[PDB]
Amino acid sequence: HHEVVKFMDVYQRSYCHPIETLVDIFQEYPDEIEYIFKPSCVPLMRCGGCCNDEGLECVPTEESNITMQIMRIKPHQGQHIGEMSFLQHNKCECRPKKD
Amino acid sequence: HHEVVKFMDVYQRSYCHPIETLVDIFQEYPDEIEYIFKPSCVPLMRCGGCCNDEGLECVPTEESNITMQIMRIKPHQGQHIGEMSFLQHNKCECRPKKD
């Protein structure tokens, strides 16, 4: 254990901001099931944590694309390296919940 | 945008390992509903990403506790600082899925 953490630090580090998060390829690309991806996930900068109030929601305000190298494989066939671009979050912000 | 990321880097950084992840307090403590926490979430080192095969699963092998400072606030009442301990993941590893 690292003892009791400082209050001001828990809020600053937890407040809705862009943090390193791994996203599943199968979750973003639902039309790619026959080609096993290696790796099956990719690291993307997304917004995570919580808001200041219960009636708010941590969501992104800006976006961007990032190309990556993925090895697509298929049973009883072969393998191959391809270029895949994913969407990331550039800016984060809290806003009142809708649905 | 930056450019096409290196393959060896996407796998080494995406492979099931301990990464900074924010956990919701309400998700861990389902009994504390009458006392709103500030912040409502806390940063904990958990395992995230994906495994080498589809039949595997990224899960932790070891654990630990971490104390933090949280401000409990109740409607029409007052506020107060308390010590809350959360569970984190020390070691991560991939194993065949069960359910």
Binding site: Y15, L56, E93, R95 | K38, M71, I73
Partner: peptide, 19 residues
């Protein structure tokens, strides 16, 4: 210094005291 405590902004100490 007055009352510029935005709900969707870094609630400093003063804002926390008067939430």
């Amino acid at each position: 210094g007055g009352n510029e405590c935005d709900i969707a902004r870094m609630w400093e100490w003063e804002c926390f005291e008067r939430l």
